[PDB]
Design a binder for this molecule. Structure first.
Ligand SMILES: O=NC1=c2cc/c(=c3/nc(C4CCNCC4)[nH]c3=C3C=CNC=C3)cc2CC1
Length: 127
């Protein structure tokens, strides 16, 4: 049921920046979501083989998860905050594509997304 390689968390030829907004995304946004009671499905790439979701990566062609995001932030992988925000948005939207309203995974994504947006609304202005 083979899994694809997980998304990269480093890329030496990719140009990178550190910004106060990206630091906030790690210290506040990622850390807050990571500790949540509904974080567990999202702390690592979907193991479609072991979870018996054989069509997961047949439907989801741009997978993303908070384990990947956490390592990207720790590795200063991003050029700007928007790039990181895009990864969270991909993670949530993949759930809404793969699953139906009311599925536990969707309820979890929705709760995390609500919290994510609350924290993003307080993103500091870039210094
Ligand atoms: O859109 N579908 C998604 C989906 C489906 C299932 C899971 C999921 N992930 C796990 C992990 C938890 C840690 N141990 C390895 C397995 N376990 C599960 C799991 C197991 C049983 N029931 C629900 C989820 C994670 C996700 C993220 C997006």
């Amino acid at each position: 049921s083979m899994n694809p390689p997980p998304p990269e968390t480093s890329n030496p030829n990719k140009p990178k920046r550190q910004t106060n907004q990206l630091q906030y995304l790690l210290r506040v946004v990622l850390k807050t979501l990571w500790k949540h009671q509904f974080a567990w499905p999202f702390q690592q790439p979907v193991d479609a083989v072991k979870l018996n979701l054989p069509d997961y990566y047949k439907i989801i062609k741009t997978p993303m998860d908070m384990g990947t995001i956490k390592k990207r932030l720790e590795n200063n992988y991003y050029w700007n905050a928007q790039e990181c925000i895009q990864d969270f948005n991909t993670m949530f939207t993949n759930c809404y594509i793969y699953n139906k309203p009311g599925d536990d995974i969707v309820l979890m994504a929705e709760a995390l997304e609500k919290l994510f947006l609350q924290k993003i609304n307080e993103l500091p202005t870039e210094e």
